Each structure stands twice: as structure tokens, then as C-alpha cells.
Design a protein around this ligand. Sequence first.
Ligand SMILES: CCN(CC)C(C)=N
Length: 330
Amino acid sequence: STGSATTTPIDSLDDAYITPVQIGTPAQTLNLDFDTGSSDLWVFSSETTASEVDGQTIYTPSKSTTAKLLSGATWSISYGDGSSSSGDVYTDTVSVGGLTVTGQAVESAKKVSSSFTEDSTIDGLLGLAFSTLNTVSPTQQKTFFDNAKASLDSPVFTADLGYHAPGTYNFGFIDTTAYTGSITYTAVSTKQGFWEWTSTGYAVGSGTFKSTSIDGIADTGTTLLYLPATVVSAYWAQVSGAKSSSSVGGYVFPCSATLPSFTFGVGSARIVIPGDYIDFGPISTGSSSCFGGIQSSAGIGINIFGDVALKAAFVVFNGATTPTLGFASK
Ligand SMILES: CCN(CC)C(C)=N
């Protein structure tokens, strides 16, 4: 089997991407944030504290003939940005782009933190990291991908995120029309439960390539590109007036600037992030100070190849017995 679903930016800045997902019988369609940095599929629901729902579409398990309470199971998750959610668990039929999994754990939120409430466009998350990170207790549950894998034509999914435009998540096949050149594959460590790999270096604009190992994670659920302070300083040094602002919480730059590109290495291959991808707009409405799309990972403990990096590539998440990651230009 295969599946193919369009993913759409939630706003004009590509702050996140939502993908429609069918849950239950008859189908209830929710728009979920596909997140290769976590491993829980959770949704706003009829059980979510009413004051914490503001415009989201909810899953109502009592209206699904295939929903079954997973007795005794609870979940609780907190993300790198300080947000969180928790609740109980149902199993139900879940379909993405024509690919159907029966008996999928659907984690129903009883509580969500303010940033989720405040984002009316995201009805929940669909985790695509390794199932070892799944938070369901006392019996850990599998991701949608892990459940689907044996049925797929090939045990892979691909992320093709758009810049200020829709893109595609495919399951079970590689669309050879969706990228240019060849796909370069690179080794993955699953030791931390992430799609963790090592970039071979970077360049800033038309500058020379610096060969240096940068261990990090491919994370569709993170907006920006978080890299070591040395690398980030070298980038912003090429932008007149750019500075790190503790009050704003990162590097900012004059909105009048033209940003240089940023290149990252994948083996001997190179992925080029155009300068415009690194512009996240005024820090507040009407400001002439703009927020940078490349930021320091120094306070995080891990480097993160988030959407800013991934949207510059066609990315293969290869879930074979020994997983690997593939990157192609597009
Ligand atoms: C987990 C990231 N997130 C969704 C974009 C929020 C609202 N905190």
C-alpha cells in the first residue's frame, strides 16, 4: 500500500504545516501537525477542557463506531518549546492520504497548554519519530508509520515541504518526479529516538564550504534551523545590522536586508537554503526588526534541522531494519 497527502502552511511565515487525517467511522477529518521529532498521535477532542478549545476541530470518539477506549492508558507530553498536552487513549481507524491503519492509538487530549489553544489551525500532532519515545503509559504505543510499515510497498515516508506553498507527505514510495539529481543517503542513530544524523558541514552565501561534523535531528515539527553558536554567528556576521537579542530571544536583523543563502552538507552532497527561507518577518506587527530563521542550539542540547532546512530538500525517512535519511535538491 501507499499514501499521499498534501501538507499546507498554517500561516504566511510557514510557522508549521498541517495535513488532513481521517479518524474513525464515519471519518472525522482533523488537520494534524506531522512531527518527525515526536512519537505521539494526539488530538483535540470532546474530552478536552472546554476553556482550552478555541476554534480547533475535535475528535469525538463516541461518534465513531470503530473507537475503543484503551483501558487504563494515559499520556502526557512536553515539547522543546515548553508546550504540553495530556489525556487518555482510544484505538481507532486512521487514514492518511488513502493509507489506512486499523487499531491506531489516538491520544485524546483532556488538557492542552496555552500555545495549542491559541493556534486554531492545528487540531493535534501526528508523531513520526521512533516509537520508543511514545508517552502512553503503562503500555507504550506505536506510531502511525510503525503500524503501517509492514503493509507499505517500501518501508519509507518522504517529506516535501513547500516554501510559502503546499507540499506533500508520501508513505510507502519515493516519487522520482519530486526532486532533481540524486538522493544522498546518510546514517541514522536511533539512540535518542530521533531521526538523528551528522551533517558534513556548511557554507554561508557564496563562501567556502567548511567541513565539520554537525550532529542533529531531522524535525518537521520544529520551525527553524538550530545549529551551534559558532555556525550561527558566522551566518549572521554576513548580514549588516544583525544581532542576537536576549530580549527578543534570538538573532534579529533589519527587515531591509537581503539575506545570504545557507548550505548544509549531506555526505558529499550540498543542500542550499535560499536567503528568503531564513526571513521570519517582523518581531512584532509594524516593526522593522525581523526574526532570523537560523538560531543557536546552545540552550537546547541538540542541533535541529527544522522546517527551514527540510523545506529546501526532498527528504526520505527510510524505516528499513537499519534506518537512514535521504536528501535531494528539488
Ligand atoms: C509543538 C509546537 N506547537 C505547534 C506548532 C505548539 C503550538 N506549541
